[PDB]
Design an enzyme around this catalytic site. Sequence first.
Site, mmCIF file in Angstrom:
data_model
loop_
_atom_site.group_PDB
_atom_site.id
_atom_site.type_symbol
_atom_site.label_atom_id
_atom_site.label_comp_id
_atom_site.label_asym_id
_atom_site.label_seq_id
_atom_site.Cartn_x
_atom_site.Cartn_y
_atom_site.Cartn_z
ATOM 1 N N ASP A 157 0.850 -1.191 0.000
ATOM 2 C CA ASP A 157 0.000 0.000 0.000
ATOM 3 C C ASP A 157 0.891 1.247 0.000
ATOM 4 O O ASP A 157 1.389 1.661 1.046
ATOM 5 C CB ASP A 157 -0.979 -0.015 1.183
ATOM 6 C CG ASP A 157 -0.303 -0.268 2.584
ATOM 7 O OD1 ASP A 157 0.700 -1.015 2.697
ATOM 8 O OD2 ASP A 157 -0.813 0.267 3.601
ATOM 9 N N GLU A 212 12.763 3.681 6.623
ATOM 10 C CA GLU A 212 11.698 2.726 6.323
ATOM 11 C C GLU A 212 11.902 2.047 4.972
ATOM 12 O O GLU A 212 11.723 0.831 4.851
ATOM 13 C CB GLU A 212 10.340 3.434 6.350
ATOM 14 C CG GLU A 212 9.965 4.042 7.700
ATOM 15 C CD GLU A 212 10.249 5.556 7.794
ATOM 16 O OE1 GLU A 212 11.436 5.974 7.661
ATOM 17 O OE2 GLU A 212 9.282 6.320 8.035
HETATM 18 O O1 LIG Z 1 4.082 2.718 8.981
HETATM 19 C C1 LIG Z 1 2.818 2.108 9.175
HETATM 20 C C2 LIG Z 1 1.871 2.453 8.026
HETATM 21 O O2 LIG Z 1 2.489 2.350 6.739
HETATM 22 C C3 LIG Z 1 1.640 1.632 5.850
HETATM 23 C C4 LIG Z 1 1.394 2.370 4.537
HETATM 24 O O3 LIG Z 1 2.264 3.456 4.406
HETATM 25 O O4 LIG Z 1 2.110 0.300 5.647
HETATM 26 C C5 LIG Z 1 3.501 0.143 5.407
HETATM 27 O O5 LIG Z 1 4.209 -0.110 6.610
HETATM 28 C C6 LIG Z 1 4.054 -1.370 7.242
HETATM 29 C C7 LIG Z 1 5.265 -1.546 8.139
HETATM 30 O O6 LIG Z 1 4.716 -2.081 9.290
HETATM 31 C C8 LIG Z 1 4.061 -2.567 6.282
HETATM 32 O O7 LIG Z 1 3.593 -3.731 6.931
HETATM 33 C C9 LIG Z 1 3.257 -2.319 5.014
HETATM 34 O O8 LIG Z 1 3.552 -3.377 4.122
HETATM 35 C C10 LIG Z 1 3.775 -1.004 4.440
HETATM 36 O O9 LIG Z 1 3.230 -0.749 3.167
HETATM 37 C C11 LIG Z 1 0.290 1.570 6.539
HETATM 38 O O10 LIG Z 1 -0.476 0.481 6.089
HETATM 39 C C12 LIG Z 1 0.680 1.499 7.991
HETATM 40 O O11 LIG Z 1 -0.379 1.965 8.786
#
Ligand SMILES: OC[C@H]1O[C@@](CO)(O[C@H]2O[C@H](CO)[C@@H](O)[C@H](O)[C@H]2O)[C@@H](O)[C@@H]1O
Lengths: 231, 224, 698
Positions: free
Chosen positions: C425, C621
């Site tokens: 996402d 990240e």
């Molecule tokens: O950082 C949390 C927040 O990021 C999102 C989308 O930007 O998901 C991303 O981060 C997660 C890391 O825990 C991943 O599991 C996920 O795959 C990644 O895209 C949100 O969904 C989340 O609330």
Amino acid sequence: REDSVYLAKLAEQAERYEEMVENMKTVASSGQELSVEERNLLSVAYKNVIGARRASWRIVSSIEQKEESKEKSEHQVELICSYRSKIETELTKISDDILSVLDSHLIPSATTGESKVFYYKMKGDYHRYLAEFSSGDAREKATNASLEAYKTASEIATTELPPTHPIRLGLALNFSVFYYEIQNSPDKACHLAKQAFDDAIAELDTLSEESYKDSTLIMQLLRDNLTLWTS
Amino acid sequence: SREDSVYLAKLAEQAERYEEMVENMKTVASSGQELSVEERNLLSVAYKNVIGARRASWRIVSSIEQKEESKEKSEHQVELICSYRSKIETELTKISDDILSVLDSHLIPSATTGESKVFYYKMKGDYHRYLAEFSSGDAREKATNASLEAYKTASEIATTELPPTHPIRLGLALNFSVFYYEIQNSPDKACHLAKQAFDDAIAELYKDSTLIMQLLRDNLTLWT
Amino acid sequence: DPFSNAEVYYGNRTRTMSVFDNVSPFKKTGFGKLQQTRRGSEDDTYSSSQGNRRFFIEDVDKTLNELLAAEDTDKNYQITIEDTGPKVLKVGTANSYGYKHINIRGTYMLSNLLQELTIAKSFGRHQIFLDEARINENPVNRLSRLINTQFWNSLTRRVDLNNVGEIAKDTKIDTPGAKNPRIYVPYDCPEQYEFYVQASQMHPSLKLEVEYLPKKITAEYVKSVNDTPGLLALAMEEHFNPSTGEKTLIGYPYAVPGGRFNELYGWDSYMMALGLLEANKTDVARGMVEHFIFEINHYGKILNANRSYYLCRSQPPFLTEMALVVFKKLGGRSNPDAVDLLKRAFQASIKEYKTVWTASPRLDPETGLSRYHPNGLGIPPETESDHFDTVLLPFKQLYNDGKIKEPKLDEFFLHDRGVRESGHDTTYRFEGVCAYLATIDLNSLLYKYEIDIADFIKEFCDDKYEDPLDHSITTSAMWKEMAKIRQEKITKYMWDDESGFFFDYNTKIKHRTSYESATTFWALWAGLATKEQAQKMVEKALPKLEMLGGLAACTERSRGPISISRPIRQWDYPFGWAPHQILAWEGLRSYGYLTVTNRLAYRWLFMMTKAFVDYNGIVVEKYDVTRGTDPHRVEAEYGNQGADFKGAATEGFGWVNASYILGLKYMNSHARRALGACIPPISFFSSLRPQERNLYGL
Ligand SMILES: OC[C@H]1O[C@@](CO)(O[C@H]2O[C@H](CO)[C@@H](O)[C@H](O)[C@H]2O)[C@@H](O)[C@@H]1O
Ligand SMILES: OC[C@H]1O[C@@](CO)(O[C@H]2O[C@H](CO)[C@@H](O)[C@H](O)[C@H]2O)[C@@H](O)[C@@H]1O
Ligand SMILES: OC[C@H]1O[C@@](CO)(O[C@H]2O[C@H](CO)[C@@H](O)[C@H](O)[C@H]2O)[C@@H](O)[C@@H]1O
Ligand SMILES: [Ca+2]
């Protein structure tokens, strides 16, 4: 002699470096060649002793320049100028001291390629230190003697030392600084440091753990100098 | 001239050339006028740097001597270190005598302000204490006694003339409690004096006051 | 010990002190500003590496402020290569008790000094002795140390009576019912219910609410608690008081993906378990297996995150591999606790396979492949209050209440939920279509489940497994056969011999996609590709994805043109993510391409190290794998926040932390040394003798 060595190690611990010089000086005068540990003790002794004057010289020079831009400052300037003059006198005396030990004892008796490179590099260093502050003909004699010493060191380092050796890398770093700061040749400086950095990459694995850490920090200084010189 | 000697003392501090800083300020203090607070700090900084590096070398040399004593069959290295340490002790003695003689002949007698009274006597107590750190025999006894007297005399004037938040007074208490703990080996008097000078300061009203009180609490914690 | 934990490291004259009066009041400003120039000569490099030099920091706060005043010119409490200070600072030597000093040179050692001083200050120290070895530390050794010894601890969570209220606190929903923290408890967990109530009454200021979930959790119910969100209970164990023996409950530990998180996440947890096993923090990795079993049992599925608004949504499944790797680390068959754990995890895995991934509506009946196609009604409540407004012309209340039905909105939100469950996402591979795709991603991971479940049945169930739900009997041969069916369906619908890619296959319109994605390498990780398929993927797919810093999430061609109408998305080119690297490294290893993994890991490791060295030890990240100077700068969607710290970074990011430790496992001594000296890939590879060129597949 083995005593003078022990007393140099003690003076280093006490951070009394002019006494470290005295002990290492008489060791370098006696005919026998110095080990690795002993020539590093000699370099550390003299570099710490001249280093304090270099730092003083530079801070007094800045004070002097600041002061001579003020209106009606001739009296302060001549106090500053005369104090700087006393520091320059010790600078030349410390340099001549190690330079004479090199020319009369250590460079003639050096039999390994390492020792030969180590000492020609030291010689280039102290002629370079003389060039940093000397006036007129003395600056030119030191500038030319510095180039010739680094040149000789480089010729020998090319055939007797692998490209990753701390001594070789350190030689190119100091030679590149000479080109940039003393001869004012940014093209020669930049390329020498770049070629030396690159050439050390291929064989990083052949070095002992302690030598790899010496070469890492030397290469860090090469990198950071390259950044400065390419603005 | 006197102004040039002060200027050269400031220039020598910039160069961290403290032996020369001592020469310029020693001539300022030995000739005529009372020292301003600025000139009094320049003098004090000059000797504290010269004596401070020697004291640090001395402590590391003695620490090495102590290790090499307990090594088997080491008489030759022990003679070397001890001889080296004695050279340093000689310098320590010459430097302390130099400032003490200046304090006795010029700075203490010409002191009008009560604050500079406490400063100069605390300084005298400091340099007698530095002597007592390495001296032996009756020269140690003479340094201990003269140090205690200078500190006691400084405390009396400060106790009656300086707020308990003044840095010069707090500083005096810190060094005097150190004299008790390190020289006279009276941990009770060290504690009591340090506690009391913290208390009477925390009982009332600058960064420099709180730094010293910090050092008073730190030593106190360690000593407990 | 110069490298002990900071808790230890910072926890005669070296003790008793007199007045410091070594500096006149005129020294700093009596002659104006007088900053020394850094010397570029070799100078004291030899003493720096071999001398065991130590510093005396008389006043930690004064030195800190000096260093920031001189070296932090943009005022971000960081010393980086973009700061324009002189890059030298004098510090007093220990042996002279500060009366003599040496020079610390360069952005990197000065940044480390900033870090050490900031950390010492955090422990209340206002005066310290400091080993130069702690600030000239080789960057590869330093980041590894910090990941292993400090970052995992800071990423660790463990519910107890005193922190439930804080962990449950949530800020993504701004309804009246979300003001208080809330905890939801499975209806058949009464010991846990009583525990959370007891936690509430001991901390009444939190106003912690405890609610039983219904016996059956429907999409209708989850929508019904949109305005009363809560944390979800996870696995717990019994704990006793030493003195009285009073029983309480304490949660199994787990790791969060980043410091700002308190929730257990889905597919992060497996990548983190891998790094945690390397750090011998096996209890944290095992804890998460315990929680994943608990979730499957009580919520039907492994959850995106353990909050109520996620009850209908999962994430990419890794439970059988996670269970296997922990099982081995605990001692395998020789450890009966590990044998029991493996059985409970594979039971849970089998339930997850049958009742989530291969059940309607995720199962595509025609092809038999699965889609990220979660249940759930209405508008997702946890997003920003205006996140869906540009897709709202008529209201929100009446649409969720089912008063006004709109099937184009329902398809919009179905794809949105599926995009989240896919982990990616967001990406242009999935926007507007995700819930109709049978991705190579998910069906590769199901192939892994089948092969792994087959081995477990053979070896721990006497080749006869009985479903506790339907009481069917299955054998290892039956599961190996379902894998074979899957392997040939994937090739049929997805394999593109000309590009060397597996493409997601769209199941509504019944046609294969052409979006080129790094997840094509998951067919290697899961073991379903053939030798010939793997070989064409290395030859033709990999050159489209291998950038400077590693594998881009997709090709620049597939992502397409970026404009104001079509902004950048974080799971697309040019961004690289740690999961894509890790799965691809092991996949390629499996098929005999370890030499290719070595090259790809060197790229990714260099990029993380460069950012670590040059930018105050940062870990981020995701990375820009095409950016040369600042690859850690990623402004896509909500952008990176790993840079928001002062002095010293504290945790990094779970799978990124893990990716660095895992990638280093491939590096031999020559490559570790070149990473330590910040040698870019172009220079490292071109420096190799032609024999050693082969070690990196060149
Ligand atoms: O950082 C949390 C927040 O990021 C999102 C989308 O930007 O998901 C991303 O981060 C997660 C890391 O825990 C991943 O599991 C996920 O795959 C990644 O895209 C949100 O969904 C989340 O609330
Ligand atoms: O119908 C069982 C089914 O429901 C789920 C989730 O709603 O679990 C519920 O039912 C279980 C069996 O009674 C309880 O143990 C659980 O606590 C409850 O939430 C799924 O996990 C399960 O497949
Ligand atoms: O080929 C490498 C590797 O893949 C495995 C499964 O992990 O087998 C795959 O490769 C074969 C094609 O060459 C196929 O026969 C098999 O179906 C496929 O899964 C391993 O056997 C092998 O080590
Ligand atoms: Ca900065």
